[PDB]
Design a protein around this ligand. Sequence first.
Ligand SMILES: CCCCCCCCCCCCC/C=C/[C@@H](O)[C@H](CO)NC(=O)CCCCCCCCCCCCCCC
Ligand SMILES: Cc1cc(Cl)ccc1OCCNC(=O)c1cccs1
Ligand SMILES: Cc1cc(Cl)ccc1OCCNC(=O)c1cccs1
Ligand SMILES: [K+]
Ligand SMILES: [K+]
Ligand SMILES: [K+]
Ligand SMILES: [K+]
Ligand SMILES: [K+]
Lengths: 276, 282
Amino acid sequence: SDSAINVMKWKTVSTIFLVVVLYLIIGATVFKALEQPQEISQRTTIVIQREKFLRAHPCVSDQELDELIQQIVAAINAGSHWDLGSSFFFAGTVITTIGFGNISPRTEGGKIFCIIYALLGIPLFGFLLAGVGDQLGTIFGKGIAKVEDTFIKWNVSQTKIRIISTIIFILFGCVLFVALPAVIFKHIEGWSALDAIYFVVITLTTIGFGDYVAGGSDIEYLDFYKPVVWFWILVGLAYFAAVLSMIGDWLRVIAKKTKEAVGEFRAHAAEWTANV
Amino acid sequence: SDSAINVMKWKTVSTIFLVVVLYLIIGATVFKALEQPQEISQRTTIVIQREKFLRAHPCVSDQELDELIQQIVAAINAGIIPLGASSNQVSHWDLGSSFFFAGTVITTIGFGNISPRTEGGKIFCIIYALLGIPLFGFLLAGVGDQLGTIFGKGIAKVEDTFIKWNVSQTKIRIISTIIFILFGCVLFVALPAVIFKHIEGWSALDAIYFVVITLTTIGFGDYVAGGSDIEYLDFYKPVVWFWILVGLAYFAAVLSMIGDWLRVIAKKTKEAVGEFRAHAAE
Ligand SMILES: CCCCCCCCCCCCC/C=C/[C@@H](O)[C@H](CO)NC(=O)CCCCCCCCCCCCCCC
Ligand SMILES: Cc1cc(Cl)ccc1OCCNC(=O)c1cccs1
Ligand SMILES: Cc1cc(Cl)ccc1OCCNC(=O)c1cccs1
Ligand SMILES: [K+]
Ligand SMILES: [K+]
Ligand SMILES: [K+]
Ligand SMILES: [K+]
Ligand SMILES: [K+]
């Protein structure tokens, strides 16, 4: 029965859908809980700054200030960040689906070329990202081969070592691809320890908020700083690519433990019910 | 044999790397060619607006005036309505917008228009995405499967209609691939674009632009459906959410198709180069 297999699939999809919808509701409340207060204090202090500017300076009134604000808002639409170097940056953001968006095409023509460029670029880059990831994955293979002959054969059996190996991949991976670049971002880019990691994650996950852009701030980079972040991204995006895939498998493993843990809990409702 | 193929793989990756390097170069030159002129005309006229306002009031704090703008821009990263008229203010972290924000996180669209300002929200965003992204991955795959089978039912209808005697199985696949694109761009691109134009006030190009930038998960943020306050009947926002679920599913397959074409154009060109080397000399 073909429609029976499809009923099993829609049952699976529909539950995950709710888990997602539920995951959204939970997060939506946690963010508002965290961000709501700062918005009020920050939005109240900005109000004190308008009232203080007209009081401190009789020179300016409400008639000139509103006209001023209208010009700054328009300045948001504009912002050279389209020079040879920044555009090459823009292209990278386009084909990686990071899209920080701080610099986006404002021309009807640039919008058309961006569309085409993206549709052709993103798949192209995917092949590269696949090879880079494959290379890095095999490099990792040579490393664990050296480690699997030292202290794998000794005490603990090989059945539980696969758990130890996965921890090594995360340890080093976090150090090289997260820790080191975050350290560098802090000093060079001036970002706090947290803001550094925040950038690393929101970037290598292709989220790309744009609130933190390494090399985006306008002042004083080193000669080879920008080229090194490019390489970090090519290899960084591949790392989270695997990491995100691993976390995915953790979920399909767990999803079963909870699904049978619910069958257990119902079971010992069942017989516990018949013994009464 | 094991290490032989390894040496062979690096050969392919290195060539693709260079192709990408060259692809970024050509792109960079094409964007700055398009965007550089308008950047200049806008940056010269803005200087005209600052000079026009400098001599306007001799009693201004001249040098400290440019410091004020720095404070406004620094405040623009977060939602700010700094105007005397209509002091009433709408929250961008309310229950409805924060829900949106989470959707942008787990879909890796990241419009960035509204991002966490708090050290706590940032630490939760990290955890949220790391677990959220992979989770939403399964959903998108499930919605990819469902939407796919519903298509397999539709083509099973047309494959017995146009089918006649003396037909080839390999050539009909090209027909199906076209109808997939056709109806796809209609429902998930054409239809939503038109709605975006009227309801959201966007131009026909800005709507398509938004769609492509969004459903490819690029997420500039320069255009966001439902961003401005306007009215939003509320028959609208829920739809957009659904469109996103399926629209992301659609491009996922579309983008994966283009990759197959590129791979194809890759072999034809690679043997076309072997042909040209074979003969070409004469
Ligand atoms: C942290 C912010 C978000 C919090 C996470 C909210 C998740 C709430 C969902 C709880 C899961 C129980 C719901 C019932 C599910 C069952 O009908 C079903 C099989 O019957 N199980 C699954 O689908 C498989 C369920 C797979 C569960 C995946 C979510 C696990 C996240 C655990 C959160 C730990 C974070 C701690 C900080 C590092
Ligand atoms: C942060 C980042 C993202 C990608 Cl997708 C690729 C490379 C990259 O490395 C930083 C260098 N940054 C620049 O070169 C800039 C020019 C104009 C503003 S920043
Ligand atoms: C473009 C987009 C992307 C995702 Cl991932 C999810 C939803 C979404 O748009 C739909 C409704 N929009 C809202 O509910 C808003 C609240 C505040 C600004 S928009
Ligand atoms: K993005
Ligand atoms: K963005
Ligand atoms: K993305
Ligand atoms: K992706
Ligand atoms: K983005």
